[PDB]
């Protein structure tokens, strides 16, 4: 039963819309259990300067109860049926989803809908989640990898909306009022911008019914039915250096502006990223790994870990890499690293791409290893790519790629571009933007 | 046949490295493979090869040789490194081929 | 072509073969073995650990280089998970390359060479691998637990002790493989594959003799107390007593007494009301914490009790309150309903844990190795609810009465000694 | 001391009375020689029951007196010898602390003969708790003790440490004549009693080496 086929067998994903705008979709399997959730296209990019951290201050109260059922009633009603409620919020895409028995499929939908519409927002709970967030920022602050990516955005998209952290400021969290959280839900948590996705042993039709019943949005004007377009974010080739020679290791992240979900090139870019791949101290492969950079990393002890990344957004993006290393080897790593990028724009071979493709294919499948993951794919596909993109399709695009394509594309987004840099830790050995910049050409 | 098989014994006495107490393999010039091989030698085999060499050098500084009795004999010469080295060069050709491929 | 079915041959030598074609675009083959750190002796400690890292080394058929370049060439992956008594070597590639990734899987598990140099160039990694893992104090108290809870076999550490780093030999590796990776103790599972193939391979390429070879020395129970004063502001603690073993119908009682006291939140940033233990601890301490139901099921024994993470000062009240809340449940404090809900949370947890290819292959395997069988997800459902409100209250007693073991690490200055609970 | 010394006066902070635990710490570490020490609450300093242990010490054996000796006057030693074949050493451990104390034995043996050595070290302590003490063993142990003390005070260090310790724990000074009395004012009973207090009280234990053959406290 060759790969080729098992790909076209997978049950198609059905999509149906209501009058209010909400979109319902799912992938049916013979799985006795399943997952359902509502993926809202609204994050921090959507926040302004005065409400930075609402989408987050909200994600904290979306589980402390609704109007119909207070705290203990909500929690108890969920726990007692062995369901798993959890979610998140990013710069431009929030989500709340539940994992449960295929039986409670409909009873779940009602719950999801009751959180996105009737969140309680008890003001007793707001002066408690205030201290709690303020406390999670103290924890999150000691997470280099994060302190780093934030700083990366913070300067790569400096001056715009994307340059804001998801958690928001300290002053915001200290003063955000019941009003704002309310108004945030009101302005953003709206049907046309939400997507009820689910996958497992469920009937698309029954699902759409439960929806029509509890997701009863009423749209009168055109305003309510319109999906706002966000003011563009300007990429700035710059750097932000946060030094502290007292930290054990240094973190560095380098990136160029990305195309954004829409563009087909994103495929090529991911193939590219596969050629370089990633590495870290515990890989058994060692000096034999196929990734040139991982080899050097091993031979010379260049780092503790490194990773390519192709973060995409609606209209923009960030394509780069991130490595962790000791103060005294940051330079060589950075050197070898840019080196491998240049090797992409100029001398990629067919052997490298072949493997690259196979590695992408498998990661593309491991993307859908569970109901939560498949539900996440569906939620984010409609919300970003418009419809759903099948594995059989993805795979056709991934096969279309070759050397010439990779080179022509990496050259398109990498060669002679002014990158954004973020360094944190004992970063003395790494230096001068002017130098790093010159690493962007020749190879 | 048994032709260059007696020639070999001749050449062996011709070289004369045995006059110093060195096995045929103690004289190999240390290129990259040889170096790797030597790192794979078991503790004792390596320490012995070392003394043989450190002794031959001391001979050479003195401008002497071993009294005829102690000379290595063509048939008692242990090719202690030959097999390791063979493998090192083997593993290498694999890599080389696998990378053009 | 819909849902086929789970075949499971059982060959001469005692080598099991459990397949299952589910038509996923990806396969995941895996060799489960009855090996582990419990077959180690004071003499060859950590030889199990090292064997786990030695997976990428040259084998009689493939070279250290080609194994990695070979698997990487097809977007494949090799991995080795292990417990104190169960190693699981397993690959995972796209359907069309099952043959390719197989050769190495077979070569790695059956024809290892453990060349002196490669081996000794690898032993420094034990230093590393063990340091990263040990970043989670969570895994620090578990090591010391099993040490205090036993006198042998299971008392053996899962990560090579320090003094033995760099003192393991190629023999110890060999001898541990010859006397444990025996066809009678091996099961070659697999998903996304047709039984006729997975079988075809197992017989044509698998050599190794059978018969348990060396057998683990039955785990005596100790009931120790290992405290690790180390400054760290958060005191981690685990108090347990001998529970049930792999299979025992008494263990399904604990699994239910687990979910009854609370087994880790189900709602992000939740309060877990359905968790007796959690709620009980909350009504005792003021500051942050976490407490849960600890349950381990081993072949010839088991562990059971709770685990607490609290501030160094409120460690006393949190741990004691964690006890009374376990006694009160040993004295009729269990509703006929708490038992009905706990029964679902357990069916759920199980049902979900098998959605991921890894968790599924590990379900089929484990069973197909500890009995060469396979219960239907329907039969396991019965055993769950066939548990009475009694069985639960009984497990709860067996705990309060049996001898207890304990492990704790942090600023223990305010933590209690086992002889005070 | 007067014209120059100063600083604060009065107890200041006081030590939190030592509770007893009775633990078991084992340190597996490869090292071929397994060291072990099994003890139980002993007596405090200056207390009466001390002298008794000090005499029960020299009665079981407190480290050889003859270079490369065999120590016959050492019950414990001889007892262990009659049990193991290979090299070793075992002695009478006695610590006297302000509000508590320790007592028991200590064994150094090969990793394999650790079992027999430690166990044999026990029975030899029980047998002494059950009348196994001659009225003579007690008279000899009384001298070895007067000797050890009398000699330890020849070196300026050991002497100043004698005067000091006392002049600090009571601001007094017993004569080497009075301490002599307390030593022999110990009856053959007191000794057999200390020996019991050991077999009965709760025990603690420490051990490090290839403990693979060493026993757990709950097996003695």
PDB file of C-alpha atoms in Angstrom, chain C residues 179-388:
ATOM      1  CA  UNK C 179      22.408 -12.583  28.144  1.00  0.00           C
ATOM      2  CA  UNK C 180      19.301 -10.434  27.715  1.00  0.00           C
ATOM      3  CA  UNK C 181      18.517  -9.751  24.076  1.00  0.00           C
ATOM      4  CA  UNK C 182      17.347 -13.339  23.679  1.00  0.00           C
ATOM      5  CA  UNK C 183      14.529 -14.140  21.202  1.00  0.00           C
ATOM      6  CA  UNK C 184      12.322 -15.372  24.067  1.00  0.00           C
ATOM      7  CA  UNK C 185      12.425 -11.890  25.642  1.00  0.00           C
ATOM      8  CA  UNK C 186      12.055 -10.044  22.320  1.00  0.00           C
ATOM      9  CA  UNK C 187       8.942  -8.811  20.515  1.00  0.00           C
ATOM     10  CA  UNK C 188       9.105  -7.196  17.073  1.00  0.00           C
ATOM     11  CA  UNK C 189       5.988  -4.982  16.926  1.00  0.00           C
ATOM     12  CA  UNK C 190       5.031  -2.565  14.120  1.00  0.00           C
ATOM     13  CA  UNK C 191       2.392  -0.178  12.753  1.00  0.00           C
ATOM     14  CA  UNK C 192       1.552   0.840   9.187  1.00  0.00           C
ATOM     15  CA  UNK C 193       2.828  -2.600   8.073  1.00  0.00           C
ATOM     16  CA  UNK C 194       1.242  -5.850   6.762  1.00  0.00           C
ATOM     17  CA  UNK C 195       1.913  -8.789   9.130  1.00  0.00           C
ATOM     18  CA  UNK C 196       3.259 -10.933   6.275  1.00  0.00           C
ATOM     19  CA  UNK C 197       6.294  -8.642   5.996  1.00  0.00           C
ATOM     20  CA  UNK C 198       7.079  -7.794   9.614  1.00  0.00           C
ATOM     21  CA  UNK C 199       6.953 -11.553  10.046  1.00  0.00           C
ATOM     22  CA  UNK C 200       8.982 -12.348   6.922  1.00  0.00           C
ATOM     23  CA  UNK C 201      11.821 -10.239   8.349  1.00  0.00           C
ATOM     24  CA  UNK C 202      11.813 -11.497  11.963  1.00  0.00           C
ATOM     25  CA  UNK C 203      12.571 -15.060  10.806  1.00  0.00           C
ATOM     26  CA  UNK C 204      15.071 -14.450   7.981  1.00  0.00           C
ATOM     27  CA  UNK C 205      17.339 -11.951   9.778  1.00  0.00           C
ATOM     28  CA  UNK C 206      16.885 -12.506  13.557  1.00  0.00           C
ATOM     29  CA  UNK C 207      19.474 -14.982  14.936  1.00  0.00           C
ATOM     30  CA  UNK C 208      20.104 -14.609  18.718  1.00  0.00           C
ATOM     31  CA  UNK C 209      19.224 -17.533  21.001  1.00  0.00           C
ATOM     32  CA  UNK C 210      16.182 -17.550  23.277  1.00  0.00           C
ATOM     33  CA  UNK C 211      15.429 -18.437  26.866  1.00  0.00           C
ATOM     34  CA  UNK C 212      15.582 -15.650  29.429  1.00  0.00           C
ATOM     35  CA  UNK C 213      19.315 -16.346  29.745  1.00  0.00           C
ATOM     36  CA  UNK C 214      20.069 -14.444  32.958  1.00  0.00           C
ATOM     37  CA  UNK C 215      17.049 -13.661  35.151  1.00  0.00           C
ATOM     38  CA  UNK C 216      16.469 -10.669  37.411  1.00  0.00           C
ATOM     39  CA  UNK C 217      16.846 -11.276  41.145  1.00  0.00           C
ATOM     40  CA  UNK C 218      13.317 -10.739  42.528  1.00  0.00           C
ATOM     41  CA  UNK C 219      12.985  -7.263  44.031  1.00  0.00           C
ATOM     42  CA  UNK C 220      13.037  -7.377  47.824  1.00  0.00           C
ATOM     43  CA  UNK C 221      11.273  -4.449  49.467  1.00  0.00           C
ATOM     44  CA  UNK C 222      13.200  -2.117  51.765  1.00  0.00           C
ATOM     45  CA  UNK C 223      11.238   0.927  52.867  1.00  0.00           C
ATOM     46  CA  UNK C 224      14.045   3.437  53.001  1.00  0.00           C
ATOM     47  CA  UNK C 225      14.415   7.146  53.548  1.00  0.00           C
ATOM     48  CA  UNK C 226      16.766   9.200  51.329  1.00  0.00           C
ATOM     49  CA  UNK C 227      16.845  12.952  51.986  1.00  0.00           C
ATOM     50  CA  UNK C 228      18.901  15.291  49.765  1.00  0.00           C
ATOM     51  CA  UNK C 229      19.572  18.671  51.366  1.00  0.00           C
ATOM     52  CA  UNK C 230      20.578  20.966  48.515  1.00  0.00           C
ATOM     53  CA  UNK C 231      19.368  24.536  49.008  1.00  0.00           C
ATOM     54  CA  UNK C 232      16.971  24.554  45.995  1.00  0.00           C
ATOM     55  CA  UNK C 233      13.900  26.539  47.206  1.00  0.00           C
ATOM     56  CA  UNK C 234      11.363  23.909  46.166  1.00  0.00           C
ATOM     57  CA  UNK C 235      11.157  20.744  48.237  1.00  0.00           C
ATOM     58  CA  UNK C 236      10.162  17.760  46.111  1.00  0.00           C
ATOM     59  CA  UNK C 237       8.897  14.735  48.051  1.00  0.00           C
ATOM     60  CA  UNK C 238       7.508  11.282  47.352  1.00  0.00           C
ATOM     61  CA  UNK C 239       6.140   8.938  50.008  1.00  0.00           C
ATOM     62  CA  UNK C 240       5.167   5.482  48.775  1.00  0.00           C
ATOM     63  CA  UNK C 241       4.493   1.861  49.759  1.00  0.00           C
ATOM     64  CA  UNK C 242       4.516  -1.374  47.777  1.00  0.00           C
ATOM     65  CA  UNK C 243       1.571  -1.311  45.367  1.00  0.00           C
ATOM     66  CA  UNK C 244       0.650  -3.860  42.738  1.00  0.00           C
ATOM     67  CA  UNK C 245       2.473  -5.572  39.903  1.00  0.00           C
ATOM     68  CA  UNK C 246       2.047  -5.615  36.140  1.00  0.00           C
ATOM     69  CA  UNK C 247      -1.344  -7.248  35.682  1.00  0.00           C
ATOM     70  CA  UNK C 248      -2.697  -7.845  39.220  1.00  0.00           C
ATOM     71  CA  UNK C 249      -6.449  -7.094  39.404  1.00  0.00           C
ATOM     72  CA  UNK C 250      -5.608  -5.238  42.596  1.00  0.00           C
ATOM     73  CA  UNK C 251      -3.587  -2.689  40.557  1.00  0.00           C
ATOM     74  CA  UNK C 252      -6.663  -1.566  38.640  1.00  0.00           C
ATOM     75  CA  UNK C 253      -7.823  -0.602  42.123  1.00  0.00           C
ATOM     76  CA  UNK C 254      -4.837   1.717  42.617  1.00  0.00           C
ATOM     77  CA  UNK C 255      -5.211   3.115  39.101  1.00  0.00           C
ATOM     78  CA  UNK C 256      -8.683   4.104  40.252  1.00  0.00           C
ATOM     79  CA  UNK C 257      -7.423   5.235  43.663  1.00  0.00           C
ATOM     80  CA  UNK C 258      -5.046   7.294  41.582  1.00  0.00           C
ATOM     81  CA  UNK C 259      -7.629   9.336  39.669  1.00  0.00           C
ATOM     82  CA  UNK C 260      -9.649   9.582  42.875  1.00  0.00           C
ATOM     83  CA  UNK C 261      -6.961  11.508  44.765  1.00  0.00           C
ATOM     84  CA  UNK C 262      -5.861  13.467  41.689  1.00  0.00           C
ATOM     85  CA  UNK C 263      -3.478  12.697  38.845  1.00  0.00           C
ATOM     86  CA  UNK C 264      -2.302  16.007  37.351  1.00  0.00           C
ATOM     87  CA  UNK C 265      -4.711  18.791  36.148  1.00  0.00           C
ATOM     88  CA  UNK C 266      -6.961  18.539  33.068  1.00  0.00           C
ATOM     89  CA  UNK C 267      -7.661  22.264  32.694  1.00  0.00           C
ATOM     90  CA  UNK C 268      -4.776  24.683  31.904  1.00  0.00           C
ATOM     91  CA  UNK C 269      -4.054  26.726  35.077  1.00  0.00           C
ATOM     92  CA  UNK C 270      -6.843  24.741  36.669  1.00  0.00           C
ATOM     93  CA  UNK C 271      -7.797  24.092  40.275  1.00  0.00           C
ATOM     94  CA  UNK C 272      -8.641  20.398  39.873  1.00  0.00           C
ATOM     95  CA  UNK C 273     -11.710  19.998  42.140  1.00  0.00           C
ATOM     96  CA  UNK C 274     -12.165  16.347  41.104  1.00  0.00           C
ATOM     97  CA  UNK C 275      -8.806  15.885  42.847  1.00  0.00           C
ATOM     98  CA  UNK C 276      -9.211  14.989  46.533  1.00  0.00           C
ATOM     99  CA  UNK C 277      -5.508  15.312  47.294  1.00  0.00           C
ATOM    100  CA  UNK C 278      -5.096  18.617  45.473  1.00  0.00           C
ATOM    101  CA  UNK C 279      -8.110  20.277  47.130  1.00  0.00           C
ATOM    102  CA  UNK C 280      -6.998  18.794  50.440  1.00  0.00           C
ATOM    103  CA  UNK C 281      -3.550  20.346  50.197  1.00  0.00           C
ATOM    104  CA  UNK C 282      -4.982  23.679  49.139  1.00  0.00           C
ATOM    105  CA  UNK C 283      -7.170  23.857  52.250  1.00  0.00           C
ATOM    106  CA  UNK C 284      -3.902  23.510  54.204  1.00  0.00           C
ATOM    107  CA  UNK C 285      -1.254  25.746  52.597  1.00  0.00           C
ATOM    108  CA  UNK C 286      -1.464  29.345  51.401  1.00  0.00           C
ATOM    109  CA  UNK C 287       1.373  29.583  48.811  1.00  0.00           C
ATOM    110  CA  UNK C 288       1.891  27.754  45.446  1.00  0.00           C
ATOM    111  CA  UNK C 289       2.432  24.003  45.129  1.00  0.00           C
ATOM    112  CA  UNK C 290       1.386  20.796  43.417  1.00  0.00           C
ATOM    113  CA  UNK C 291       0.676  17.273  44.711  1.00  0.00           C
ATOM    114  CA  UNK C 292      -0.337  14.064  42.915  1.00  0.00           C
ATOM    115  CA  UNK C 293      -1.074  10.338  42.875  1.00  0.00           C
ATOM    116  CA  UNK C 294       2.077   8.328  42.185  1.00  0.00           C
ATOM    117  CA  UNK C 295       1.598   4.841  40.689  1.00  0.00           C
ATOM    118  CA  UNK C 296       4.197   2.494  39.194  1.00  0.00           C
ATOM    119  CA  UNK C 297       3.463  -1.013  37.964  1.00  0.00           C
ATOM    120  CA  UNK C 298       6.500  -3.318  37.671  1.00  0.00           C
ATOM    121  CA  UNK C 299       6.759  -7.030  36.751  1.00  0.00           C
ATOM    122  CA  UNK C 300       7.421  -8.447  40.211  1.00  0.00           C
ATOM    123  CA  UNK C 301       6.381  -5.462  42.320  1.00  0.00           C
ATOM    124  CA  UNK C 302       5.061  -1.915  42.283  1.00  0.00           C
ATOM    125  CA  UNK C 303       5.014   1.493  43.947  1.00  0.00           C
ATOM    126  CA  UNK C 304       2.248   3.803  45.094  1.00  0.00           C
ATOM    127  CA  UNK C 305       1.771   7.014  46.993  1.00  0.00           C
ATOM    128  CA  UNK C 306       1.883  10.723  46.379  1.00  0.00           C
ATOM    129  CA  UNK C 307       4.425  13.379  45.283  1.00  0.00           C
ATOM    130  CA  UNK C 308       4.589  16.970  46.515  1.00  0.00           C
ATOM    131  CA  UNK C 309       6.222  20.118  45.166  1.00  0.00           C
ATOM    132  CA  UNK C 310       6.031  22.930  47.673  1.00  0.00           C
ATOM    133  CA  UNK C 311       7.880  25.904  49.079  1.00  0.00           C
ATOM    134  CA  UNK C 312      10.610  24.969  51.537  1.00  0.00           C
ATOM    135  CA  UNK C 313       8.690  26.425  54.481  1.00  0.00           C
ATOM    136  CA  UNK C 314       5.235  25.081  53.690  1.00  0.00           C
ATOM    137  CA  UNK C 315       6.683  21.651  52.948  1.00  0.00           C
ATOM    138  CA  UNK C 316       5.651  20.430  56.381  1.00  0.00           C
ATOM    139  CA  UNK C 317       1.967  21.336  56.201  1.00  0.00           C
ATOM    140  CA  UNK C 318       1.764  20.313  52.529  1.00  0.00           C
ATOM    141  CA  UNK C 319       3.191  16.860  53.059  1.00  0.00           C
ATOM    142  CA  UNK C 320       1.233  16.107  56.250  1.00  0.00           C
ATOM    143  CA  UNK C 321      -2.030  17.430  54.809  1.00  0.00           C
ATOM    144  CA  UNK C 322      -1.241  15.187  51.826  1.00  0.00           C
ATOM    145  CA  UNK C 323      -1.295  12.232  54.233  1.00  0.00           C
ATOM    146  CA  UNK C 324      -4.458  12.793  56.304  1.00  0.00           C
ATOM    147  CA  UNK C 325      -6.185  13.237  52.943  1.00  0.00           C
ATOM    148  CA  UNK C 326      -5.032   9.720  52.011  1.00  0.00           C
ATOM    149  CA  UNK C 327      -6.070   8.213  55.347  1.00  0.00           C
ATOM    150  CA  UNK C 328      -9.502   9.851  55.257  1.00  0.00           C
ATOM    151  CA  UNK C 329      -9.887   8.042  51.911  1.00  0.00           C
ATOM    152  CA  UNK C 330      -8.845   4.765  53.505  1.00  0.00           C
ATOM    153  CA  UNK C 331     -11.685   5.187  55.989  1.00  0.00           C
ATOM    154  CA  UNK C 332     -14.783   5.210  53.797  1.00  0.00           C
ATOM    155  CA  UNK C 333     -14.062   8.705  52.456  1.00  0.00           C
ATOM    156  CA  UNK C 334     -14.796   7.557  48.903  1.00  0.00           C
ATOM    157  CA  UNK C 335     -18.184   8.273  47.298  1.00  0.00           C
ATOM    158  CA  UNK C 336     -19.741   5.673  44.970  1.00  0.00           C
ATOM    159  CA  UNK C 337     -19.624   8.527  42.496  1.00  0.00           C
ATOM    160  CA  UNK C 338     -15.998   9.600  42.971  1.00  0.00           C
ATOM    161  CA  UNK C 339     -15.406   6.027  41.849  1.00  0.00           C
ATOM    162  CA  UNK C 340     -17.606   6.419  38.760  1.00  0.00           C
ATOM    163  CA  UNK C 341     -15.833   9.621  37.593  1.00  0.00           C
ATOM    164  CA  UNK C 342     -12.361   8.223  38.311  1.00  0.00           C
ATOM    165  CA  UNK C 343     -13.414   5.308  36.121  1.00  0.00           C
ATOM    166  CA  UNK C 344     -13.984   7.627  33.162  1.00  0.00           C
ATOM    167  CA  UNK C 345     -10.860   9.745  33.625  1.00  0.00           C
ATOM    168  CA  UNK C 346      -9.038   6.415  33.455  1.00  0.00           C
ATOM    169  CA  UNK C 347     -10.827   5.181  30.295  1.00  0.00           C
ATOM    170  CA  UNK C 348     -10.192   8.597  28.767  1.00  0.00           C
ATOM    171  CA  UNK C 349      -6.508   8.847  29.652  1.00  0.00           C
ATOM    172  CA  UNK C 350      -5.958   5.374  28.199  1.00  0.00           C
ATOM    173  CA  UNK C 351      -8.073   6.034  25.068  1.00  0.00           C
ATOM    174  CA  UNK C 352      -6.202   9.255  24.326  1.00  0.00           C
ATOM    175  CA  UNK C 353      -2.695   8.017  25.042  1.00  0.00           C
ATOM    176  CA  UNK C 354      -3.095   5.731  22.017  1.00  0.00           C
ATOM    177  CA  UNK C 355      -3.734   8.395  19.351  1.00  0.00           C
ATOM    178  CA  UNK C 356      -0.026   9.110  18.844  1.00  0.00           C
ATOM    179  CA  UNK C 357       1.834   6.489  16.806  1.00  0.00           C
ATOM    180  CA  UNK C 358       4.415   6.251  19.605  1.00  0.00           C
ATOM    181  CA  UNK C 359       1.922   5.672  22.418  1.00  0.00           C
ATOM    182  CA  UNK C 360       0.031   3.150  20.263  1.00  0.00           C
ATOM    183  CA  UNK C 361       3.018   1.051  19.227  1.00  0.00           C
ATOM    184  CA  UNK C 362       4.000   1.101  22.887  1.00  0.00           C
ATOM    185  CA  UNK C 363       0.563  -0.248  23.794  1.00  0.00           C
ATOM    186  CA  UNK C 364       0.628  -3.118  21.322  1.00  0.00           C
ATOM    187  CA  UNK C 365       4.256  -3.899  22.123  1.00  0.00           C
ATOM    188  CA  UNK C 366       4.217  -3.895  25.954  1.00  0.00           C
ATOM    189  CA  UNK C 367       1.323  -6.341  25.966  1.00  0.00           C
ATOM    190  CA  UNK C 368       2.531  -8.473  23.061  1.00  0.00           C
ATOM    191  CA  UNK C 369       5.733  -8.937  25.119  1.00  0.00           C
ATOM    192  CA  UNK C 370       4.378  -9.556  28.640  1.00  0.00           C
ATOM    193  CA  UNK C 371       1.885 -12.228  27.489  1.00  0.00           C
ATOM    194  CA  UNK C 372       2.113 -12.522  23.688  1.00  0.00           C
ATOM    195  CA  UNK C 373      -1.540 -11.503  23.681  1.00  0.00           C
ATOM    196  CA  UNK C 374      -3.719  -8.444  23.155  1.00  0.00           C
ATOM    197  CA  UNK C 375      -6.740  -7.407  25.182  1.00  0.00           C
ATOM    198  CA  UNK C 376      -9.361  -5.478  23.197  1.00  0.00           C
ATOM    199  CA  UNK C 377      -9.900  -1.847  24.206  1.00  0.00           C
ATOM    200  CA  UNK C 378     -13.317  -3.269  25.093  1.00  0.00           C
ATOM    201  CA  UNK C 379     -12.051  -5.883  27.588  1.00  0.00           C
ATOM    202  CA  UNK C 380      -9.772  -3.389  29.352  1.00  0.00           C
ATOM    203  CA  UNK C 381     -12.861  -1.184  29.665  1.00  0.00           C
ATOM    204  CA  UNK C 382     -14.559  -3.873  31.779  1.00  0.00           C
ATOM    205  CA  UNK C 383     -11.636  -4.442  34.158  1.00  0.00           C
ATOM    206  CA  UNK C 384     -11.744  -0.705  34.872  1.00  0.00           C
ATOM    207  CA  UNK C 385     -15.345  -0.425  36.110  1.00  0.00           C
ATOM    208  CA  UNK C 386     -15.408  -3.946  37.606  1.00  0.00           C
ATOM    209  CA  UNK C 387     -13.776  -2.152  40.527  1.00  0.00           C
ATOM    210  CA  UNK C 388     -15.950  -1.709  43.602  1.00  0.00           C
TER     211      UNK C 388
END
